[model samples]
Every structure is written in C-alpha cells, then in structure tokens.
Target chain A: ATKKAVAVLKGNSNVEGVVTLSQDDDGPTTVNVRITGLAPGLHGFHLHEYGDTTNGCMSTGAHFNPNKLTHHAGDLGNIVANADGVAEVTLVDNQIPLTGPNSVVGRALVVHELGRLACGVVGLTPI
Target chain B: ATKKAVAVLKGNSNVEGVVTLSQDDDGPTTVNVRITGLAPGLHGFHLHEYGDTTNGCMSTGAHFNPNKLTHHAGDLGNIVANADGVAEVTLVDNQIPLTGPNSVVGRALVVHELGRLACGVVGLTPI
Candidate 1:
C-alpha cells in the first residue's frame, strides 16, 4: 500500500494541489511536500512533463524528457516563503524515474517567480 | 474591448489552459501570449498571485502585488517551446497596473523547470 502524488504551487494564475507521485511505493521515500497557500515570499519548484491539468497550466508539457535528456535530471528546484506569504516544500524522489515510459505517471508540480530566468527565452531552460 | 491574459507552460506538473489576461482591452497593446503545451522547450511563466482554482495550482497567490509591492510589478516572463514540445508566451501589460488593492484580480499562471534560481532559497527571488 504505497502510492502518492501531491504537489501544489500558487502565485496567481491558478493551482489546486495533489500529486501522490504514483500511488507510492513505500509511502514515504521522503514525500514531505509542503506548498501551503503561498504569496509571502519565494517561489520556484519543478517536476513537470504532463498529467494534464487542463490548459491553465498548459497540459503539463516540458521537463520530463524521457530519454531525450536535457538538464540531466538534476532535480529542478526552488520554492520559498516563511515570513508570511507561505512556501515550504520539501524534496526527495529518489530520482523519481519509477519505471520507463518516462514514468512520472501523470506529471506536474511547478512554481516560479523571482528565481528568474528569461535572458533569451526559447523553450524554458533557465531553472 | 481589450482584456487579455493567456499564459501556459508545461514541464510535467500537470497543467492545461485559459487566461486571456482579462478579456482584451485593445487586442494587441502587445498581447502575444503563445503557450503550446511544451517539452522539447523552455518553461517558466508567471502572473500568479491568486485566482483560486482549488489547489492543484495552489489557489494562485503571490505575484500580483497590489500595493505591498515586493517585485514592483514586473511582467514576470518566461515560456518557450518549439521544435516539437512547445511554448510561445509573449508579454505586454501596459504595465498591467489595472487598479485597486493590487490589481491582478484572480491570478495564477506558472511554469518552471530550469533557468536556475534557488541559491539560499526563501520566498523566491533569483530571476
């Protein structure tokens, strides 16, 4: 009985919250995601490729490049806020590659703001 | 008749679409939002501050800054996708200062993976 996927990030456009990360294999390989209703400070987190949340987040498209490899899965990271705004996400996926087919099951868990990257914009390659 | 806000970015956290910016006040004071469900692309788009879609997107909470201004209302841009997995979000808000207690009424539209920004990490700011 292990399967979990719950990721939530909100700075405005819209986000709900939920990503058990594939129903869980051990339940707590270290899933301490804490994206609590933000806005007080910093933001930027990742694990997106597609789980289809709609078009609001854009069909959860980039980042999980199967075998096409780009960032080399360094575990794209960033998400902060504690003074008041709110942002306390923890990270640990053991590399998240559950089992082929770009196993993200249904991916998506993003957020960004000051953690900036837009120097020459092309196809999202800053953070 | 001008009110627009259409932002989209995907790297796998699960996201779909819709955010004409407001409805379009002039159609193109520079409204060239081009988000096309990405992967072989660049990502990181913002407008998020809060619009409330439940929690998957996390109720959209921090980038609008009505008056308590932090980032000073920068366009918060980044969304590139082409050569396959896509992203084409353009920017223009005439400053997007529409009005009131932090205009950006219902906010949220985020996407991030790389563009690196998370050094000391805390409430976002690395762009």
Candidate 2:
C-alpha cells in the first residue's frame, strides 16, 4: 500500500518550500524535500508535535515524539544546502508511518539552523 | 489589573495585520483589530483552538470553543471591510477573558469570508 502527504513550507519573510512524504509496503518512508531562500549550511529537519506555525515555527510545539523517546535515529536528521541557498534532499525513515495512531498528519515538519528556517504541516494529498 | 496580547496576522499571499486583545478591571475584554489586504465584505471573526498557521489559517484548528458551545455572541461575530480592503473594528467580548483557564492565550484569531482571509495568535505582550 502507498500513501502520501504534501506540505508547503514558509517562513523568514522569504523562505519557502514543498515537502512530500511517501510510504509503501516495503522499506522505509521516503521524504523528498526541496526548499529555497536559506543560508548555505547543515540544517536540522524533524517533525514537530503540532501543525501550528502561528509563532513562526516556535508554536509547533516540540519534536514529534509520541513514544516519549529521545531525539535519535527515529527522527529526521539533517540536510545540507548548496551555495544557491537551496536544499534538496531525500531521506528515509522506518519509524514514521503514513497512517494510523503514529501517522504524521496534522503535525509539523520543520527545518532549522540557529532558528527556524521554514515549516509545513503533514496534510493528506491526492494519491 | 490589565493584561494584553498582540499578534501579527498574515495570509492569502498578501493579507496581513495586527490584533491586540486587552482586559481591564471591568466590563468585557476589548478586542482592537485592524487588518489590511482583504476583499471588502463581511467576514467571520473568531478565536480558533490552535495558534498554528503552518498551513495558513486553516491549520489554526476550529473556532476557540472550550465550552463546546454553539457559535453565538460569546464567539466573535463578523467584521466588515471597506472599499480599500481594510477592516478595522473594535469589539467587546465577555466570554473571552485575558487570563486564567478561559484565557485566549495560545489561541488563534481568524478572519474569513468564503475561505480563510488572514490569522494571528493570541500571545502575551509587554503592557
């Protein structure tokens, strides 16, 4: 089975991007993310507890941790941006699911350096 | 005692504004709201359950209905915008307090027509 979610991330008065998460019956979930208007560097990317981005990404609550476990391999790790201020990276994780209680829906996926770079919510998309 | 909260509302690819909630020693709490960049018309205004805007105003959740009551006078009613697409209104709401459990903090203030117009979060501010 395959399920998918798409989100448009925005922030910093100029930051913007689209993130798509896809899951299948085998292997791990694939997160294909592409962002623009960010400084060239390594940035942390993770799912947050809330989809809220009212206070920028700060209002999204903490990282998605329904298991009450520490931030580790189970969570999204990092992405490296190029000199053009663009970051395009694909990552796979077996921990997050596309549905069920552990579904990433209604949660926030954030990219951050010293502060929030951009954010988007995991929302259902056309399959 | 007096308490106040301020928020920067934005949406519709251009809509933006500031909402200030204030409370004094007596009477209903005052909501001084001013918004720019909206189509001129009557718009529904209310506090939402969540302050998140990662997915635009829709991500703020539903109207702030802690009592789970019907939408009535207790909830913010409507706002009228002018020909210049600016809506400036002052309303007094007794149901929404500035503090305590019934507080409006961490909630969202939304303006909507057929769809979401713009939004902001209810957050503490310097008095």
Candidate 3:
C-alpha cells in the first residue's frame, strides 16, 4: 500500500470536515477534502506550518511553505461550499508528499472564510 | 518549541543508533545523527523515499527525491565514521522541514556503507 494521512477539521461551531492525503511512490500527493456546515462560499483551504493549535486556529501558524516560495504558501486555492454549506474537493498536487523528503504529515490543514473556521493536523494512518 | 521528530537506525546486525530532527518555524531542519558499529569510513546518510522497511533497507525505496532532481538526489554528502565505528554528524538543511508543506516525518532515514547498514522511519514527537 502507499503512504497515507488524514486530517479531521474542527473548531467552528457550525463547521467541520476531513482531508485525506495519499501518495504513490515519489509522485505527487492526492488530497480529498469533505466538509459540512460551512458558510457556502470560498474558503482558504491550506496546510499550515505547524500542527500546534495551542491558540486555536491562530497557533496553527502560517500556510505551509517549506520551499519559501511565493505567496499563498503552497496553498491549494479554495474549496467552495455548496448552498447547503458542504464542500468536497479532490486535488492532485506536485508539491505536498505523504512520504519521501517532503512529506506533509504532522502539519495543520486549515480552512478560512475571512476568519479561520476549521483545522486539523495531518497524521499518518493505515493504507 | 519547534516541530520535532526522531529515527532509530537499525537493520544491520552490528549497527544501531538514533537521529533527531528539529526545526523552528520556517527555518531549516536540524538533523543530528549518532550511530555506532560501522566499518569506520564514509557512509551514505540520507532520508529515503519511503518508511516501508518491510523488506529491510531494500523496501525503504530510493533516496528521497520528491523533486525528482538529478544525481545524488537531496544528498547531504556523507557522514564519516571514526576508527571507533561511531558516526556523529550535525546537519542543518534547507531542503527538508519538520513542519509546513515539506514535513519529512514518515520518511525513512538510511545509512549506506556500500550497502544499507541501517535505517529507521522518521516519526513525530513533542518539541
């Protein structure tokens, strides 16, 4: 089996979700996000620099940017929630890896709609 | 505190030890390796592409190259073991991070002396 990880988003009174990350060999990672009870708009979906949520969504730190690249910081753009306040996004990225030298395990996956809404730390799981 | 991880090198009958990975914010990761019972020469100390040691070092995959770069592939040079067969190297690397998008937690740390002499999977821990 391949390397895999998952993040369970939480913290908002009416927002929650799950993000699954999977990688095959040294190729790109596949991310699948499923969330419900959002604001039915575009949300800042990204991996943060830290999994430390000591200060709620604030302490998760900035967006993940180990390459020190441009703004958005390895951002996966946004996840659009439907009129029913649910979001489901499937993305394959060249940046994030579940294993290898650039694995994203142990970081924070967050969603923001102006203010930070939901977050969860990326963690390894059985394939 | 920063993000942190650890790996305990093993596999070869006579080789054993530990590696500590640490990083502060968006800074480079600090890798400290301490192992003994080598052949007292240079060894390929690196982060492999996989933590799947199901078949020993052979299952650890290749040297980590999510970038799929050329040649040595994120090689940190080599670590020299003294006459006592003990290798202690302190390396701070920009290419690898313990947090953020490039977190390496869940990869494999390997030491090759002609052949793979030891290996361990990088795993997360409190800072």
Candidate 4:
C-alpha cells in the first residue's frame, strides 16, 4: 500500500505513511497507508477498498462500497484515533468483501474528520 | 433546520433531530439538525452551513466556507456527541462569513467522526 500511495498522492506529496498493525477475527492484517497531513487533531480514517488514488483519490469514491452502502463504508465505518493524532482501526466487516481484484484494491483510503464522510445523514446497519 | 432537514433527509427518514444549545461569542445561537437513522452509534454530524438540501444536501458543499476553509469547517469543525448520541456544537468562527444571502444559509450541517475531512490532508491556519 505504501508503494501505491507513493505513486498516487502527487508531486513531492512526500506525505508520511503509516503501517496499521491490527488483530481481527482473521488474525492480524497489516494494511499500510498514507496519513493525511491534516491539522493537529483527530480525523476520520478508512480503507477505501481501492488504492487507485486517481482523480486525487475521489475516483476511489467514499470507501469500499461492496453493498452500495453509504455512511457505514466511510472512516466513520468505526475507527478512531488517539490523542497523538494516530488511530489504529481494526474491524472484521462481513459485508465488505475481502476478496476480488476490483476488491478494495486500487481504491483510496478516505480520511474525513468530524462532519460526515458519506456526505449526508447516516443510515448504517449494526456492526 | 429541523423543518429543512425533514424536507431533505429522504424516505420515512423520520430520523430523530437535535437542537444545538450553547453560548457563543455572540451570546447564544442555536442550530438544529436531524440525527441519522442508522445504528445507535455516533455518526458524523454537522451544520453544512447551507439549507438548500438539494441533491440530497450535496449542494451544501461542506460547511460554511467563508474563507474556503476545509477540515475546520466540518462538524469535526470542533464538536462531538455525548454517550447518548447527541452533540451540541457551538463555536465562534471569525472565518465563517456569518452575513449575506450566500451565507451559511440553505447549507447543510455535516457530522463526521474522528477522521479527516476536506477530502484529504488538512491545512488549518489556527484560530
């Protein structure tokens, strides 16, 4: 994932990247990503299910949409950061398909702090 | 805002709503909003600064961007909910143009979680 973000972010994006070490029901899955050089505070983070980062990442669309679901697929998908501005998000999503080429690969990881990521009012199912 | 949201949200969206109760520099200004009709968890919430609610509220185009602010404009604009899934956001922003027709009016209130907003890497200039 680091290699992919390095290639996508943009010229001299030189953004600091992070490696997520998490333990889920499927054991530990390490997914590396680029941290948004956002303000000095908590921000939303998520696996866009695609690393394409094209169109400055918008093309990846709001997180992984396996179920064409909104809100729930965003960083608000259920992950938060600590006081140090770093969040270790680890969750087992049965709805988010963990298989396939068009699967989360080439997608973008969206980080939208407070104020909604899916764009509007949320309508998510229980995790 | 409640009536506007009702006319916007969608479906039996009969979603519960909230009214911000607080004291700002200008004394006290209340901004009411609707709660997401999703899980009992906290979802990103905000006053999109616009009330148009068209295009499902996308036309709101983020928060009151008086100066084209990003992350700072979101609900994470500086507010969080209590254990009861309710957040009372009230802040005094010198940047948010609180005047004029194109003001934060007809804008939507956005509510995100502990993630990044403004699409990606954030850049704030301090209060």
Candidate 5:
C-alpha cells in the first residue's frame, strides 16, 4: 500500500505552491514540490512544529524537532527559485517518515526566502 | 499586546467543537473550550505534532514537543463531557504558550472519546 501527503503552500501576498509527498511501508518518504512567486534565489524549506498561522508562518513555531537533535534535521535545507520566481524539486527524506514516531504529516511546511515566505500544513491525501 | 488563537475541531461525523486561546507576552496562556457530542465521561484533550487530517487525528503527528521532555507536556490532560456529549472549559496553562519556542499555535487539538474523536488546526485569531 502507498501513503501520500500534500501541503498547499501560501504566503502573505507572495509565494505560493503545492508540495506532494509519498511513501511505501518502511520506506523513505518522497517529496515533490512546485512553488511560485519567489525572489529567485536559494531558500530554506522547513517543517516547523506547528501547522499554525496565528502569526503568519511565525506561528508554526521552530523547526519540528521531536528528536531534539542539535542539527534539527527537520530543516530540509535550501532550494533555488528561478528567475520566474518559481521553485520545483523532489527528494527522498529518511529523517521524516510518513508514519511511526517521527512522521511529518500534519506539521507545517515553511519556505524561507532569506526569511519566512510561504507555508502550509501537511495533510494526508488519498493515493 | 493581546494575542489569540483558535481551533475548530471536527471528528468523523461525531464530535465537534471550538477552542480559543489567549495570551500576553511571556504570560500564561488561557484556553476556552466548547465542544459537543461526546460520551459522558472524562476525555483527553491534546495538541498533536501536526495540524493535519491526512489520517485524521493520526496526522497531527506525535505530541508538539520541541523541548523533547519525556512527559511531553503537550497533553492538556482530561476534560469532562456531559451526558449530552457537550463540554465547556476554561483554564490557564503555564506550560503552553501562544508565543515562544514551545508555543502551541499551529498545532492540532485532538479530543479523545476514549479514542481519537475530533481535531482542529490551531490558528491565530484576531483579538
């Protein structure tokens, strides 16, 4: 069976896009991202602690650190947005799974263009 | 400034409710809960990791634990639902805040009917 998830990214009058995720039982989760309306540069894509918008991306809290690792593995590093203010990339994440104690669903997917830009709550989707 | 947050909880054709949270900078957060359609008994009210419904209450991930304390400290403990499956409560919690490294915003509030019943994504609301 396959488990899937998606995050519809939104920012305050700026960046926007969708993030799709998939995984098989006991396998790494695959992430596919397509976002637009950025500043055309390398930006940080992160999963924060909350799916909250109480403070417009800031309310998502810190990077999701259930493990409390010093490196904070939940920060998915940087992705480059092209001149058209769009970013599209895909990767497999072992640190964040779809199930088990460390599943990443229901959390917040935040994108940082130098600072916090857009974010969305990760939700489970039908496969 | 007075900051506020809220969650509109929904279960699988069962429980439904609203949670309102208010706080002042660095002060204790107060929670106001109004819920309906529960079994007459004490039920668990918790903030899970994600504000997700991909797998219903399961997607909120684990408890919102950026500090990684063994006890989690995310579980707001139990509240009683009346015979009509209705519950109303207000409490001030020192552990959960609306602003901080351990803020509860953007998380998922899940209520237990002895099991997972309903959940809502915590969002910042205008005070």
Candidate 6:
C-alpha cells in the first residue's frame, strides 16, 4: 500500500510553504518541501513529536526521537532559499513511515531560524 | 437578526471547554461558557485583543478594551471550577458586539491562572 501526507507552513507574515510526504511499498518516505517568502539564507527543518496545535507550534513538544536517537539522526538538515524567497528540496528517510504504528502523522514539521519560523502538521492525505 | 459565535478551549491536558456568544437586537451580548477538566479553583477569564493563535494564546495579545478603559472594563471576572473540574458561567458586556467594526470575531476568549489556560477564537456561527 501507499501513503501520503502534507503540511502547510506559515510564519510571521513572511515565510510559508507546503511539504508533502509520499511512501510506496515498504521503503522510506520521500519528502517534497517547497517554501516561499523567506530571506536568502539557510533555515533549520525537523520533525517534532506532538500534533497538539491548541497551544501553537510550541505545544508540539520537542524533536521526535522515539528510538532515542541523537539530534543528528532526526535532523532533515537545512534548506537554502533564494533572493526571491523560494526553496524547494526533496529528502528521504527510512527511519519513519508515513503510515502504521510509528507514523509521523499528528507530528509537526517545523522551519526554524533561532526559533520556530513556520510549522505545519504531518497529516494524512486523500491520495 | 441574531448572531452567535463559539470558542473551544484546550490546555496541557487538564483543562478544556467551550465559550459561546449570542446576541439579539442591539442590547448587550450574552456569553455562556462551559468548561470541564479544570482544577477545582478560580480561574481568571477575559477577552483578548488578537485571535492569532500561532504562538498559542500568548499571541492573542492583551486584554481587549477599545474605549481605553481599565482591565475592569475588559475583565469577565473569574469562574470557579468544582471538584469535578467543571465550571459554567454566563456573562454580559455592552461594549463589544458580535457584529460590527469593533466585533470580537478573530479575537480570543481566554481563561487564565497566572498564565493562559484553555483558549479559543471568537468566530462567526450560522443563523
């Protein structure tokens, strides 16, 4: 079976974007993240533990590491935006699946600059 | 015509509830709030200036008072939760209308205990 998810990121009237997750067969989950309205620079991106947005992104708890891995294991690295405030990148991770018991759905995808710049939940998609 | 609005409150895991607003004609708006899952005690409650929950209720800004009145003007006072972690209150205010430029929609209705408890947005409802 295949699974997919998406997140819509929003920041302080500046940065925003969409991140999509796709998984087929029993392999890794592929992520396609596209962002706009940012300054030309690098931004930290990662998956966080909770999906409770009632208290905003901060309520999502810390970086997701159910297996007790180090920060390096969980980091999706950074994305470099251009002068026009756009950045698109694709990443792959076998550690987490888009569906099943250890699914990342209900977790948070965050873009950070010193603090959280923008965030969205990794929720299931129709297709 | 009559207008109504509602706000859903949620916090940590111990507090949650619903706050409702109903207005008819041109008199004061009637607020009926019902909260469950709170500690048995008094909690401060008020109408805040902004409805932006991006950073939790803190992003909702300060207490709302368009006429430059004191906190007393914006305060809806406090509600006491019983041993069952439940509190239901009804309040009235003539200053803020459910409709108009000074409308409270997109603003926040908050419950506080030194800090914010559960909070929800004041949004429009169907007739």
Instruction: Please tell me which predicted candidate would have the highest TM-score against the true structure.
Output: 2
**DockQ each:** 0.03, 0.07, 0.06, 0.01, 0.10, 0.03
Q: Choose the strongest candidate by lDDT.
A: 5
Model 6 CA lDDT for position B108: 69
By descending TM-score, how would the candidates be arranged? 2, 5, 3, 6, 4, 1
Better structure of 3 and 6 per TM-score: 3
Per-residue accuracy of model 1 over A1-127 as CA lDDT, tens digit each: 2433233343344322332333244332344455545556656555556433333344444655444563545244665667655554555655665334444432445655652111000110001
**Clashing pairs in model 2, backbone N/Cα/C closer than 3 A:** A52-B52, A53-B52, A53-B53, A54-B53, B47-B64
TM-score of chain B of each: 0.28, 0.87, 0.88, 0.43, 0.89, 0.88
Best by DockQ: 5
The residue ranges of model 6 lying beyond 4 angstroms of the native Cα positions read A1-127, B69-71
Off by over 4 Å in 5: A66-72, B1-127
- Across residues A8-117, which tens digit of lDDT does each residue of candidate 5 receive? 67768678888888889757778899999998999998888666654567767777854564254687768999999889999887666766544565467899867789
The predicted structure with the larger TM-score, 2 or 3, is: 2
Candidate 6 docking classification: incorrect
CAPRI verdict (incorrect, acceptable, medium, high) for model 1:
incorrect
lDDT of 5 by residue, B1-127 (tens): 3877777677775788888888888677788999998888999888776555645677667766544653546778799988888899998876676665455554678997667889876764445
Looking at model 1, residue B96 earns an lDDT score of: 50
lDDT of 2 at B115: 82
Residues B1-127, candidate 4: write the lDDT tens digits: 1111111232123343433222233332344333434334555554454332223335334444444533544343444445554544444434332223233322334444442121221100001
Model 2 residue-pair collision total: 5
Instruction: For residue B120, give model 2's deviation from the true position in Å.
Output: 12
Per-residue C-alpha lDDT of model 2 across residues A48-122, encoded as one tens digit per residue: 766565567786677776445425632688888899989998888876665554456656778888487787655
Error of 4 at B61 (Å): 42
Candidate 2 lDDT over B85-123, as tens digits, reads 898989888777655544556557788775887876555
- Across B1-127, the per-residue lDDT of candidate 3 in tens digits comes to 4677777667846898878778887677788888999988888887777555545677667677534542443576699999999999899877676554334665677888758999766665556
User: Among the candidates, what TM-score does chain A have in each?
Assistant: 0.27, 0.88, 0.89, 0.46, 0.89, 0.86
Q: List the residue pairs that clash in candidate 5.
A: A51-B106, A52-B106, A54-B124, A106-B50, A106-B51, A124-B54, B38-B85, B50-B60
Model 4 lDDT tens row, A1-127? 1111111222123233343222233332344333433344555655554332223334334455545632553333534444554444434444432223223322344556563222221111011
